[PDB]
């Protein structure tokens, strides 16, 4: 029918017992589906940027290249992050969700979604987490929108899955509005470790401090999926507000089921937990893009539908 939600504080969290109580209490406020451990804990690292001294020599390609260039280093830092004074887990490998193979018939999606390791999603999966391939790619926009359907579809698109962001926060339209494409690194955890998550958040905050950021980060959100039966320039400054958290609510209603069905993981009976977002802010400059200017500059093999 629809995705129902239930939110619990982050301060003291523990997954509900599976069968400790045969019958839940009558005045219990918890939903009846909030029984077992979640399928996964989705941690999103929202990466926003701003080219502060914007000038007229920037192009639409740079609006994508400048933030996505940092994506590979950010993914490597997240993957290699280790808690230096841990008492429990140390590395991402001990807690994140492991995926073996995509479903047969997804030969087209092979080498675009991770396999045989941690389920970490980012725009770098287009170039297979290879900054050399990213730098040698002649059309970043063409590669990103290569697998875009020409009509609306129920399933989430590959670009939507990899960016983890609603379409209005990306796309070549932001160049006209002088904004910058903002993406999200999606971490999928099999286990929840408060200390590791706090260390990761603090490490990212230390690496890329976000000014004027006051995100609450106070509650988890659990989403339950029911069964389906049919029978002059003034470049805009990076602003963090109440709409930046809970940005997953603006994604497609088939986003997470589409992602998890690719790996033969079902969400029909179970639920997932969405951790509070980790803000990351990048300060970019136009000189980087100007020096990284390439041939085949203003021509791309992708025309968005404009009628």
């Amino acid at each position, epitope marked *: 029918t629809g995705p129902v939600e239930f939110s619990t504080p982050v301060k003291d969290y523990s997954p509900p017992p599976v069968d400790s109580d045969h019958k839940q209490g009558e005045p219990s406020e918890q939903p009846e589906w909030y029984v077992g451990a979640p399928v996964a804990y989705i941690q999103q690292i929202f990466v926003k940027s701003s080219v502060s001294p914007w000038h007229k020599n920037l192009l639409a390609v740079d609006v994508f290249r400048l933030p996505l260039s940092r994506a590979f280093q950010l993914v490597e830092e997240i993957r290699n992050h280790a*808690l*230096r*004074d841990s*008492s*429990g887990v140390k590395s991402l490998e001990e807690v994140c969700l492991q995926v073996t193979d995509l479903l047969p018939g997804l030969r087209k999606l092979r080498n675009l979604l991770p396999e045989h390791g941690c389920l970490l999603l980012s725009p770098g999966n287009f170039w297979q987490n290879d900054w050399e391939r990213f730098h040698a790619d002649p059309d970043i926009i063409g590669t990103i929108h290569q697998h875009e359907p020409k009509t609306l579809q129920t399933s989430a698109t590959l670009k939507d899955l990899l960016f983890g962001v609603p379409g209005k926060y990306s796309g070549v339209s932001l160049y006209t509005r002088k904004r910058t494409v903002s993406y999200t690194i999606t971490l999928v955890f099999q286990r929840y470790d408060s*200390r590791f998550l*706090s*260390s990761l958040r*603090s490490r990212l905050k*230390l690496l890329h401090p976000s000014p004027n950021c006051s995100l609450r980060a106070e509650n988890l959100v659990h989403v339950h999926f029911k069964e389906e039966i049919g029978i002059d320039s003034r470049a805009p400054e990076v602003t963090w507000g109440p709409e930046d958290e809970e940005l997953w609510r603006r994604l497609s209603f088939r986003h997470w089921p589409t992602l998890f069905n690719y790996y033969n993981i079902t969400l029909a009976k179970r639920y997932i937990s969405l951790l509070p977002v980790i803000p990351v802010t990048l300060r970019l400059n136009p000189q980087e893009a100007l020096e990284g200017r390439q041939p085949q500059d203003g021509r791309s093999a992708w025309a968005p539908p404009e009628s």
Partner: antibody, heavy 120, light 108 residues
Framework: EVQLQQSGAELVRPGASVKLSCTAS????????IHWVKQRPEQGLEWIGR????????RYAPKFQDKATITADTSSNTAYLQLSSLTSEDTAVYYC?????????????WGQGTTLTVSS | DIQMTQTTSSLSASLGDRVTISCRAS??????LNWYQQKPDGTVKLLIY???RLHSGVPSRFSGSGSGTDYSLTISNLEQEDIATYFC?????????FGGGTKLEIKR
């Protein structure tokens, strides 16, 4: 608002043992690690070890492996440091501290320190 | 282990004058340095963590800088209450080590 209240001064014979204490106010020790730092007048500050009161996982500097033993209990919100086989080298001022950020690992709030004296 | 070295043990200064305190790491510690202040009565207080992040409540006079193996602590203008001992602590390799500490004085 956050305080770490330490015990009084100590004076023990060499070869004995002492059980230092550290009372916490304004927060609960389950939330953060509690550390202990050793200061001698001419050797500067030395890090002894830490504890995680949630699960009791303690780790020490290799110098203090056979010397220190850090224990804490949540019920009284107090952390303790134990030193065994005391000698004249062990007289110092021991500080109690914690941290709340888990990547910078900066010691956030300190106690006033307890002076320990070892002499016949 | 990593040896933290404060070359100067004492450092004379005068009120209003800016004061700089620097310490050297034995190896790269990746901007994981902490600065502490110890009053003569024995109270210890955190001033700066990471490398330049001011702790909450610490006055704006204190500032830090440095990278790799060299770091420094600066005080914009010295007040009477700023006369104390300052230590640098590295938090890169797990056995945290402190420097020798620098003690401030008054010009005579």
């Amino acid at each position: 608002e956050v305080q770490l209240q330490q015990s009084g001064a100590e004076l023990v014979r060499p070869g004995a043992s002492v059980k230092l204490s550290c009372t916490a106010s304004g927060f609960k020790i389950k939330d953060d690690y509690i550390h202990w730092v050793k200061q001698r007048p001419e050797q500067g500050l030395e890090w002894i070890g830490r504890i995680d009161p949630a699960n009791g996982h303690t780790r020490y500097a290799p110098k203090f492996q056979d010397k220190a033993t850090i224990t804490a209990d949540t019920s009284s919100n107090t952390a303790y440091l134990q030193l065994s086989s005391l000698t004249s080298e062990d007289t110092a001022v021991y500080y109690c501290t914690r941290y709340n950020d888990y990547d910078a690992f900066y010691f956030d709030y300190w106690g006033q320190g307890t002076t320990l004296t070892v002499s016949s | 282990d990593i040896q933290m070295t404060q070359t100067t043990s004492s450092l004379s200064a005068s009120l209003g004058d800016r004061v700089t305190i620097s310490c050297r790491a034995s190896q790269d510690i990746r901007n994981y340095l902490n600065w502490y202040q110890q009053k003569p009565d024995g109270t210890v207080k955190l001033l700066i963590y990471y490398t330049s992040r001011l702790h909450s409540g610490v006055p704006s006079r204190f500032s830090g800088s440095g990278s790799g193996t060299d770091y420094s602590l600066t005080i914009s203008n010295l007040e009477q209450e700023d006369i104390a001992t300052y230590f640098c602590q590295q938090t890169n390799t797990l056995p945290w080590t402190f420097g020798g500490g620098t003690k401030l004085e008054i010009k005579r």
